[PDB]
Amino acid sequence: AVGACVLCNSQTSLRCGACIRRPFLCCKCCYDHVISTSHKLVLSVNPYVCNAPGCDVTDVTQLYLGGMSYYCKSHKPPISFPLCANGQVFGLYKVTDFNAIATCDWTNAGDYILANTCTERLKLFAAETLKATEETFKLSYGIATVREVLSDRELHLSWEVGKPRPPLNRNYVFTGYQIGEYTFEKDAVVYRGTTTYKLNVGDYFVLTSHTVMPLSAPTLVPQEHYVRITGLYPTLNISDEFSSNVANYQKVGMQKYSTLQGPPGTGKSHFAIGLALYYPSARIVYTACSHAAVDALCEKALKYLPIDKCSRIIPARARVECFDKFKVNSTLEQYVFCTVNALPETTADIVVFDEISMATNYDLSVVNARLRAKHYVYIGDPAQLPAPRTLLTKGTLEPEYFNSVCRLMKTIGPDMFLGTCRRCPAEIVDTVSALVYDNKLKAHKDKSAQCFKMFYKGVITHDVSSAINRPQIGVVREFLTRNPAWRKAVFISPYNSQNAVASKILGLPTQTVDSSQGSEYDYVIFTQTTETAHSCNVNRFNVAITRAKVGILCIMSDRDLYDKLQFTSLEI
Ligand SMILES: [Zn+2]
Ligand SMILES: [Zn+2]
Ligand SMILES: [Zn+2]
Structure with a gap:
């Protein structure tokens, strides 16, 4: 009841009763909020409601102080002061952006832009408000x-x-x-x-409608820059394998937090695990939002780090099959690999947070609240896919608005950039380098001469709203007969229903662009399926074609992206 204002910290007994999160608002700020929004209910120990019996006046602008009680204009005593006067709401200890976050329905992209361009306390208010709105929306669905x-x-x-x-x-x-x-x-x-x-x-x-907890910690801690490596003890005999990242690992020890932009196959997992070999005494907590991202860090650790000092934290309510090679649930091991939502309350010398484009500001804040570290390293790529925003239906969310870390990487640039793609044939590297990396991504591999593109719009059918293009799967079938080496290819598309049809017709293993992120395959067969903003999204396009190590076949619908593909064109 006695708390601190979410806009200027000024202690107050006032909370907005109309906000879903009921934020504490100071006398001056509570006024600016109630007088410019539909929000008029103000809470304290006792709410701001007319105390006269059976009176339903709850609007703070239509209420007054009758000695030590509250009444409307019809029931107030002669000696009464309005609750709203001189830019203040009467309370103990006597914002355009706050109003927009407090009253928006989170269906527009402009709502998410604001939730990331606002002050730090407003990034937390926006993040709890959004997550609570996303939860009440699950109740709207049918059993x-x-x-x-x-x-x-x-x-x-x-x-x-x-x-x-x-x-x-x-x-x-x-x-x-x-x-x-x-x-x-x-x-x-x-x-x-x-x-x-x-x-x-x-x-x-x-x-699974889960309870939204309040956020206390900032999305990003305040940046600290140091003159030397702090609390971390490096090696001089550092394996030649990891020598490429020594200047970058030193930058990690000379800052509170650091951002690493790593395009596909540039060495993000190698960098993350090599940081442990560089500071061999440092206790490191490896975190990511998904079980797949945490497991991919476990696979890299399994190869370089001692297995007895690793532990994979698994929530007691075990959702899916994950990493089974480390001792499970030993929070005290030197290396702890755990999803954000399962993180224990502990400390570390370094916290590594991977697949940073998939994090929300809610996830960023949770990590700062459960883990107290000397150093925080954020690894990912703002040119890859963000976390799905179930409420967002109007507008496209740009990478600078995915989260605070992504905002930093797109505005001031990342602290470290892994510039050499070692996975993809050069045709793919050259295409995405021009598309999303401002020509800064270099190819390590030669052109494979196995990257094909076919412009074929086909026929778009729909399973509710998820799209299907049977003629594009027909073109793939005709291609597989002529290219048997492609029998081992992974079929990828922007739609689950397209993938279901291709699984039956082609028999190839299936993957959506979103579920293919972080994974790599020798051959990839991609059907664009439609010409929607979803299937044309350059971050999704970037992820789709960068899954391939050897060859890719793209059956395209969009002329723009087809023309940009630096692949050999096919006919039919
Ligand atoms: Zn205030
Ligand atoms: Zn409000
Ligand atoms: Zn009244």
Whole structure:
């Protein structure tokens, strides 16, 4: 009840009753808020409501102080002062951006731009408000009750009438009824249960609406620059393998936090694990939002770091299969690998946060609250994919607005840049270098002469809204017959429904662009499927074509991106 103002820290008994997070607002700032927004309910120990019996006046601008109580204009005593006067709301201890964050529905991109260009306390208010809004939106969706169980991987669902049906992709994880978390993929549907249970007919599934906790720590700690390496003890005998990053590892010890921009295959995991070999006494906590990103850091550590000093932290509510080679849940080991949402409350000499474009400001703040470190290293690439913003439907979110770290990398530049792509054939490196890296990404490999492009719009069908292009899959089928080496290719597309159709017709393993991020394959077959802003997104395009080590086949819909591909064009 007695707290600090979210805009100027000035201690106050006032909280806005109309804000979903009920932020503490000082006398001067609370006024500026209520007089310029639909928000008029003000809270204290006792709320600002007319005390006269059965009176429903709750608007602070229509209320007054009758000695030590509150009444409206109809019930106030003769000796009464308005609660709103002289730019203040009467309270104990006597913003255009705050108003927009407090009242927006988070469906426009301009809302996310503001949530990242505002002050640090407003980045936290925006992050809790958004996450709480995203949670109440899960309640709007309809329940799915099991109508029939066909086999061990297929079932038929009955949906709730009057309430919308949530998108059926791996992005939406339901909580089954607690018969474990489950996911669905498209009258025959495919059921993927985290726990193996003999699907009961009648058992219902409801979305994982979790409670949004308040944020205390900033998204980024205030930057500190040092004259020498602080609290970290380096080696002189540092393996030749990691010699390329020695100046960069030293920059890490001479700053509180550092940003590393690493385009695809430039050595991000190698840099992250090599930092442990450079400061061999340093206790390092490796974190990322996804289990896949944490597991990819575990695979690199398994090769260079002693296995007895590693531990993979697994939340007691084990969602998916992850890394099994380190001792599980030993928080005290020198090397701790854990997803952000499972981080224990501990300290470290270095905290490494990978896949930084997938972090939200909420995740950035949680890491600063659960981990107190001498150094923080943020690794990722603002030219790769961001975290999905389920509420955002109007506008495109630019990389400088993904999070605070991405904002820094796109404005003031990253502290460190890994400039040599060692994964991709030169045709792919030269294409993305020009597209998203301002020609600063260099190719280590030669041109493979296995990178093809085909301009073919096909026919766009839809499974609700997820798109399908059967003629583009028909072109791939015709190509596979003529190019049997491509039998081992991974099929990639911007749509789950396109992938479902290609899995049956081609038999190739499938991956969406978003689920392919961080992974690499010898051959990639990409079908653009549509000409939407989603399938044309340059960050998504960049991720899609940089998955390939040897060859890529792109069946394109957009002329712009087709013309930019520095690939050999094919006919049909
Ligand atoms: Zn204030
Ligand atoms: Zn408010
Ligand atoms: Zn009244």
